[PDB]
Chain A
């Protein structure tokens, strides 16, 4: 204990330099030899070794001998400390994965890696299945072979935990990725063949219901027209709409596809013929007719999209309603410590939600007689929601291991996210929740209050509102919020309560679930929190956030309407949490969550580093290549160290929280938000 304290204190006193590293290392090694059964000592030693590797790499980027000397014992100590926890070792696993991916090709690190992989148990990898599959197509032989062996072992022992992402990665466009996934899958059919076939069928079958043929063609033409008429990129529209012609010449397989081929099939062939004639002999006179046909088909398709409000399985996918039994587990619900729930049946009718993306409402029927309702999403990449859900689970386990946070029941509400492709997926359905917009809307349509009264007052005091300067918009916003008593949420939440005890409990839960989510979204960088992305649980009062598409402060640095607020804290959300203000449960819960997140900055930092550094997921954050991601993680390292508002000082939790409060509830920041964000609510 004294050696560990001495090492930590020297680290806090003199930082990480070329003279204190060996001293702290010898202190930590002495502690490990003195205890040899202590998780803290091994963890501290491994973290010091990893930090030494990081420092010596960052120093020589502004030899491969010192790096090895510090990374071999890093892997050794990390594999040693993984076995000491056995209940929560996510940070250690992510760190060994980082070392594996960065220096696993060296002949010396590979020995420790192959020793550790067989040393530790097989369950400690079920938590890092995504981060593994994201590197399955690595161009190096040793790390690739070790990854393939590990995935084969996981599939042999736990086949249900690896089948969905494997069949997702198999249907890719990259040669190496898809052939490696196919190799692992065909190696998986040795001990379990019916499961792999059923999974392939189901995955390929409800990926067809997600986006029908006419929706695919509508999206493709809407993209290709923009591309060609804004960038003059014929070689872009060609590769955009060639896969559509390719999938259309393999024959329709359902009644919907046959009807589409009968209706629009003739024009889409002559259009391809004209495009081919043009690409043979370059002449825009041949592309104009192709675009005439394409635009006619597009205009005929776009008129029948609002009419789509329900889907029959006999018409759309005749193979999904003829299952009646399956060996697959219900998506999103599988844990190796519980009896698995199998997919028994699928309802023969889906309801399409009238929106801009039209998400279907799938509802399976498990083997235990319980209905599992899902949301089949198209035109969207669900690979970021999975990572943010993993982060939220980590934060939940962190808040559960805290005495003051456990007695107050602080936790984030999550839902299942099962991606099926790069532009399709399946989101779990949360019941009893209703949107914040769909609550004020009802309360106002019932109380005879018009919905846009504040926007109408703003447009009446000034017609060109969105063109005023900062001070004029501030004055208009203040006049609109002063001439309107905004307390619809408080009265709406009290009116729907049976008694006063239930109302009080619901209000307490609402406040202490809003505060934790505000702090977590600030640490993550959640944006676009308009009233349609926040839901209230009508039975417990808790708050649910959705649409995790704009993370890492992307919405703050965009070009049109950049938001200047860390989180959403408006007058309607504040008038419904207490009678005094946000200085009671809100501020105390913010302090608690922020100090818990700052005490455990290493775990969340490792998760966010594994998220951002993924080369196949960091395309939204760059709207060299590895220079932007750096200046993102650094930003996070400021948020968790109180160095985000100014680098010449270090703020504590009270000062940082009060500054965040003053920034989120400032009229000068709310006056600049887009009118659809509803800054007056």
Chain B
């Protein structure tokens, strides 16, 4: 079910509890499309 009144007072804790700001995978690489070519 659904219940309200969750994490409504901790600001500094919510600043890093779930907002990890995960930013990676900047370098893109090429491929050969294994599954696509296997299906075809």
The answer to whether A and B touch in the complex, with CB atoms under 8 Å apart, is: no
